[PDB]
Tab-separated table of C-alpha atoms and ligand atoms in Angstrom:
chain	number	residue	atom	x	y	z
A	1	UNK	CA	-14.840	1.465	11.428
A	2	UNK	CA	-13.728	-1.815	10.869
A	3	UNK	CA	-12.997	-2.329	7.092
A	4	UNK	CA	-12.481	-5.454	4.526
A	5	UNK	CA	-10.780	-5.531	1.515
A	6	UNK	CA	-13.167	-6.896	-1.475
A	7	UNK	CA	-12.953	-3.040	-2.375
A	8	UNK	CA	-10.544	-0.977	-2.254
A	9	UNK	CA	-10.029	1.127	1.387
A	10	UNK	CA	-11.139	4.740	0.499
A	11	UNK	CA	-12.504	7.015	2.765
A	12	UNK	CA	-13.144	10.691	2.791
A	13	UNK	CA	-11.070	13.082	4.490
A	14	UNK	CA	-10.881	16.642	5.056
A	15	UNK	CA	-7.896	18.584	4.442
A	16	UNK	CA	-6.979	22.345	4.033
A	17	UNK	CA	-10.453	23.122	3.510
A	18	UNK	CA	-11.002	20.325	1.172
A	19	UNK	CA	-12.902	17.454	1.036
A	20	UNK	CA	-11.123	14.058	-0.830
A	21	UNK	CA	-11.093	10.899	-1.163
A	22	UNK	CA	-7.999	8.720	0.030
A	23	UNK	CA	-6.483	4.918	0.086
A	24	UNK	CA	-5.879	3.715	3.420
A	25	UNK	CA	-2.512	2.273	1.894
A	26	UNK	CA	-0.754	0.231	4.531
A	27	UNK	CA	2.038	-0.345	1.974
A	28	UNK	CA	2.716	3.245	2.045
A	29	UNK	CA	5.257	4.781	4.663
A	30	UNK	CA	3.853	8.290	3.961
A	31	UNK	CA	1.024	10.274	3.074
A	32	UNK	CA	0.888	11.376	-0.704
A	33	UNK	CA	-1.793	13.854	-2.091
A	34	UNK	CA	-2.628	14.582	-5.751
A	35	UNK	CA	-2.019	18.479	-6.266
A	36	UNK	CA	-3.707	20.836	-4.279
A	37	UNK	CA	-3.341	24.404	-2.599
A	38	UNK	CA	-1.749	23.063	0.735
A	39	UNK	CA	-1.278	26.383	2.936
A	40	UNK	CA	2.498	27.237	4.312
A	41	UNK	CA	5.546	26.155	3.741
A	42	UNK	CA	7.825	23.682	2.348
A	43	UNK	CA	10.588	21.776	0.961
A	44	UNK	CA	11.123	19.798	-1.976
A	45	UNK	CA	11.527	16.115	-1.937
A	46	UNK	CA	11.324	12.783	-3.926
A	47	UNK	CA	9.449	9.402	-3.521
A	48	UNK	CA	9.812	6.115	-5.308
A	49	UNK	CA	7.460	3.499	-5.908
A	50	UNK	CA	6.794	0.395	-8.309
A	51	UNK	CA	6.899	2.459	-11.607
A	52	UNK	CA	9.746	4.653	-10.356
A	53	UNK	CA	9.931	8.270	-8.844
A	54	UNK	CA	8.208	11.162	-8.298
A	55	UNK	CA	8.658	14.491	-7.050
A	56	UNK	CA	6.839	15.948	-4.437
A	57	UNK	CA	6.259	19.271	-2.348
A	58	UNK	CA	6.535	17.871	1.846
A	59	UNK	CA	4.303	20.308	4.327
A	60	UNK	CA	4.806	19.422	7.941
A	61	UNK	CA	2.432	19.932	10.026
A	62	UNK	CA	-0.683	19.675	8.227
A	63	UNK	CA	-4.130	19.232	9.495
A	64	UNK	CA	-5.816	16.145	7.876
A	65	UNK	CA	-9.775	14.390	9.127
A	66	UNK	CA	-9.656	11.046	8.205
A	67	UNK	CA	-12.918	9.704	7.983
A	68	UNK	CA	-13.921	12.071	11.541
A	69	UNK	CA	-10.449	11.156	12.996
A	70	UNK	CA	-7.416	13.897	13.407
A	71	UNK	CA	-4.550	13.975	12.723
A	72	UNK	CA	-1.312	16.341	12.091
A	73	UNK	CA	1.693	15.169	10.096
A	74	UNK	CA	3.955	15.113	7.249
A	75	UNK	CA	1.668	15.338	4.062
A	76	UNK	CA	3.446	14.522	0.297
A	77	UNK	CA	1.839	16.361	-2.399
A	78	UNK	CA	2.495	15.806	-6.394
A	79	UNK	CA	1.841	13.805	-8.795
A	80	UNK	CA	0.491	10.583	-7.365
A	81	UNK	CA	-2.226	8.628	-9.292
A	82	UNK	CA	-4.149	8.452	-6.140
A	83	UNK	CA	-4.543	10.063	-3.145
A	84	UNK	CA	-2.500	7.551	-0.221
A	85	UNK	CA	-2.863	7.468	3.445
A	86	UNK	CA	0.169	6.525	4.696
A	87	UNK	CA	1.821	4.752	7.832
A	88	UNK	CA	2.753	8.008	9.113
A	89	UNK	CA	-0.852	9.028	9.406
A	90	UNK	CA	-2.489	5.666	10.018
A	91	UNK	CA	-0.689	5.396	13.372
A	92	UNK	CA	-2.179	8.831	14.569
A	93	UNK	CA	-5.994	6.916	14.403
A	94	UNK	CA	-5.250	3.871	15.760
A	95	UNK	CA	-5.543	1.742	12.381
A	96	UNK	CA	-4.816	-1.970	12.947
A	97	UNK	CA	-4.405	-4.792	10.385
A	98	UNK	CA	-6.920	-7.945	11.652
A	99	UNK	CA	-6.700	-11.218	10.754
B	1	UNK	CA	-2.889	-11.534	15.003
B	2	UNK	CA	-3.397	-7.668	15.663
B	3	UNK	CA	-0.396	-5.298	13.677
B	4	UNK	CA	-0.065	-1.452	14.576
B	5	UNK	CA	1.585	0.602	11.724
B	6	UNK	CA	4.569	1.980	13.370
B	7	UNK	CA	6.856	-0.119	11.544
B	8	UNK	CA	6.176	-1.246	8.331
B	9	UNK	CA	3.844	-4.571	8.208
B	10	UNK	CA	6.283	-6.996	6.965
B	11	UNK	CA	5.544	-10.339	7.282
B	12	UNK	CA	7.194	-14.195	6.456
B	13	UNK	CA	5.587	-15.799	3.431
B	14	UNK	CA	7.128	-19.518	2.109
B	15	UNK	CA	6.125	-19.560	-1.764
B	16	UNK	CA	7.909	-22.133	-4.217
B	17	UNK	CA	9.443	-23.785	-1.063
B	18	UNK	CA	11.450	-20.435	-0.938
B	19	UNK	CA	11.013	-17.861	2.687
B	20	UNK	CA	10.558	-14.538	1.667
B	21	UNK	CA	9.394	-11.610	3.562
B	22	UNK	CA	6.717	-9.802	2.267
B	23	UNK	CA	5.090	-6.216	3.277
B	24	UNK	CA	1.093	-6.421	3.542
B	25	UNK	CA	-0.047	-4.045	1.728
B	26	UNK	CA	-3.733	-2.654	1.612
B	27	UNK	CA	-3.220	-0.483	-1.111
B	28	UNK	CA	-2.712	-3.112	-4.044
B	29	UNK	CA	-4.656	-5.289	-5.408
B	30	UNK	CA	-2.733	-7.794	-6.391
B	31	UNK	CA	0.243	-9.678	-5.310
B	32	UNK	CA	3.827	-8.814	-6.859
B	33	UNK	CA	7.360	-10.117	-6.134
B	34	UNK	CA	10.700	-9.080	-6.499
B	35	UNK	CA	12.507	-11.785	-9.299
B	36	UNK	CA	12.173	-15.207	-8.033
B	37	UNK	CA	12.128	-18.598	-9.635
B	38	UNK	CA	8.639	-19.507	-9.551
B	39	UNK	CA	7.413	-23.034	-11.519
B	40	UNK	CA	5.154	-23.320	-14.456
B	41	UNK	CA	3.806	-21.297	-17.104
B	42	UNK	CA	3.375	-17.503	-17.235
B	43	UNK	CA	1.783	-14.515	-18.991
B	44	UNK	CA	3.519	-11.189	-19.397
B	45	UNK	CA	1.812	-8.074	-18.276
B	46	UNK	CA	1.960	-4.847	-17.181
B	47	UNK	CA	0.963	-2.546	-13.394
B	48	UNK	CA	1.360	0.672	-12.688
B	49	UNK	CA	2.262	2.056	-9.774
B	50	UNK	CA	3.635	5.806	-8.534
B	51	UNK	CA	6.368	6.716	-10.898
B	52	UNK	CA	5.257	4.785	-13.767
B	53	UNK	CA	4.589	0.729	-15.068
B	54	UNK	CA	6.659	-2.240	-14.802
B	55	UNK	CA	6.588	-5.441	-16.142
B	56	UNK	CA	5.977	-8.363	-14.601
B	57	UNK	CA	5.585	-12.432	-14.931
B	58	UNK	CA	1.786	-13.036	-14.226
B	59	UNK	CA	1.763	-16.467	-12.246
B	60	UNK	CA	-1.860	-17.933	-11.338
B	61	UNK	CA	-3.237	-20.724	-8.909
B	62	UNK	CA	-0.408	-20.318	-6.570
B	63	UNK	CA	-0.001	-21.070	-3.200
B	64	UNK	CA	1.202	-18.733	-0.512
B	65	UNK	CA	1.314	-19.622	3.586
B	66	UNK	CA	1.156	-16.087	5.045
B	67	UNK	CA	2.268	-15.807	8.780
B	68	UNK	CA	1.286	-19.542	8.763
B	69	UNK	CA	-2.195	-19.148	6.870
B	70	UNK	CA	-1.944	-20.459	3.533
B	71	UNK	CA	-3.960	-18.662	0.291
B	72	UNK	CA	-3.968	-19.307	-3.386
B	73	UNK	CA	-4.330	-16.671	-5.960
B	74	UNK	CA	-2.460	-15.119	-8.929
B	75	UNK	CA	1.478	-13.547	-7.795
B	76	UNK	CA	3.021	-11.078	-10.274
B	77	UNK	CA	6.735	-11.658	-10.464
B	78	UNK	CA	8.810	-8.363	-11.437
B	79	UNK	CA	11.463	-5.348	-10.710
B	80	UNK	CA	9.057	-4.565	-7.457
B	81	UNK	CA	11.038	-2.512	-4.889
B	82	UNK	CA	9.501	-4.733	-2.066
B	83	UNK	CA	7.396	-7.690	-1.797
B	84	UNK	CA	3.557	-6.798	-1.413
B	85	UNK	CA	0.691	-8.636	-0.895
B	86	UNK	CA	-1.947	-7.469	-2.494
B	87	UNK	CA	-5.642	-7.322	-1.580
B	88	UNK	CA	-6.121	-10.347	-3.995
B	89	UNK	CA	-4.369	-12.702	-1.083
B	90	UNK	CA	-5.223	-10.326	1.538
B	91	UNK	CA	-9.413	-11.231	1.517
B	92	UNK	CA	-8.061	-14.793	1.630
B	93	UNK	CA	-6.264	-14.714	5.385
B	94	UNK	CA	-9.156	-12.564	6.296
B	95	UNK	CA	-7.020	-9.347	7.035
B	96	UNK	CA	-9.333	-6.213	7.815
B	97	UNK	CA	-8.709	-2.527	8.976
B	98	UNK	CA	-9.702	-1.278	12.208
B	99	UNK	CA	-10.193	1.960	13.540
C	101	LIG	C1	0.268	3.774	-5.224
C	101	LIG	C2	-0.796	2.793	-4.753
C	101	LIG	C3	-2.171	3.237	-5.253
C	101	LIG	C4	-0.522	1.397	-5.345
C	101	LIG	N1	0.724	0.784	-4.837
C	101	LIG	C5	0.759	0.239	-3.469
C	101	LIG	C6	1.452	1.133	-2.439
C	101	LIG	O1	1.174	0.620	-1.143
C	101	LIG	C7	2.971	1.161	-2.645
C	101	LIG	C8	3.733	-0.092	-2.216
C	101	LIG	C9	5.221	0.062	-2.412
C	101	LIG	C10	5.762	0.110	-3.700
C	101	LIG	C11	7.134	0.248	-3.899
C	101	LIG	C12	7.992	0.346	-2.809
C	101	LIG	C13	7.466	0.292	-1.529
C	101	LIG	C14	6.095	0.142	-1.329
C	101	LIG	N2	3.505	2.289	-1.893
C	101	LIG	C15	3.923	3.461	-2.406
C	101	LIG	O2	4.097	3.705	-3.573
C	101	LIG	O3	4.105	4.332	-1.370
C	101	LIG	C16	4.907	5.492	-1.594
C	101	LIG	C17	4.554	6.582	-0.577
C	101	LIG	O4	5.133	6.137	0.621
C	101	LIG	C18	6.441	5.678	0.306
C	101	LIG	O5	6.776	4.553	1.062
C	101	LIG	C19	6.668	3.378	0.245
C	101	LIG	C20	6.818	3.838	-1.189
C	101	LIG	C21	6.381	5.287	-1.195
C	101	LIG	S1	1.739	0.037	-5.975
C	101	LIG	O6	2.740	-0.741	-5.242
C	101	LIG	O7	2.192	1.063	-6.904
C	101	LIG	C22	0.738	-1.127	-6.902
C	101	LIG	C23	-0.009	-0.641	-7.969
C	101	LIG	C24	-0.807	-1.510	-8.709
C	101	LIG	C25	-0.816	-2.870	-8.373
C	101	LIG	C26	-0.032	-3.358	-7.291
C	101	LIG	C27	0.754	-2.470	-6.543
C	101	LIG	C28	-0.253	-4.880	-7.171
C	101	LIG	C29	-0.444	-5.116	-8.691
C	101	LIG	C30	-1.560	-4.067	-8.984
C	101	LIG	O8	-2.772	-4.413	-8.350
């Protein structure tokens, strides 16, 4: 749906199983998920932001339903204060900035 | 205007009489810039962000044309890795997500 910004953008998705809730962050490049048990494999990595760096697990290829929409990509996991929907996943559903 | 997500939304904001390019950003709610020279008083505070806090210059009333449609609201000033705008200035240009 079509979504304004007096709150902030969260929506529920389902992943691995799981369901969350997640930022549609168009600030974000990638997707970035608190811990969880993501099935496969993966690689280790590192992200920066406003308060610095984090480390983070990257799984390729993972299955993510945001808010009834699919999607497969890259998908960050460690320790990020929120769950963030990134660019690389907001593309896949056809989000659009409106104004 | 309508913006896909493939690239990252960066946009051209004129603050202070100053051009700066600034990445709109649904995921924050506020605005923050990298060091500039704004005028007037201030009020130091602190935002977190992944990786940590940072502290910034808290600047209100201020006026910011973004992609030609102007907005006043409070700007943070600080060591920022990019310029965002927040949802705080977002609401005021009337930018929505659609999908
Ligand atoms: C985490 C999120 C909940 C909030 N952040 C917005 C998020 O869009 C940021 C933006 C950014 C920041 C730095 C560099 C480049 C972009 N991206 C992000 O960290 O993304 C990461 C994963 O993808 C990667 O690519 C880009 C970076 C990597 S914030 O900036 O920490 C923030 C928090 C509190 C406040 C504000 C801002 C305004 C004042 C207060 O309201």
């Amino acid at each position: 749906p079509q979504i304004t910004l007096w709150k902030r953008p969260l929506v529920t998705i389902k992943i691995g199983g799981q369901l969350k809730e997640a930022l549609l962050d168009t600030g974000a490049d990638d997707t970035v998920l608190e811990e969880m048990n993501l099935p496969g494999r993966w690689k280790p990595k590192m992200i920066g932001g406003i308060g610095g760096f984090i480390k983070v697990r990257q799984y390729d290829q993972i299955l993510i339903e945001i808010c009834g929409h699919k999607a497969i990509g890259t998908v960050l996991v460690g320790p990020t204060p929120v769950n963030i929907i990134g660019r690389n996943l907001l593309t896949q559903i056809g989000c659009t900035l409106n104004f």
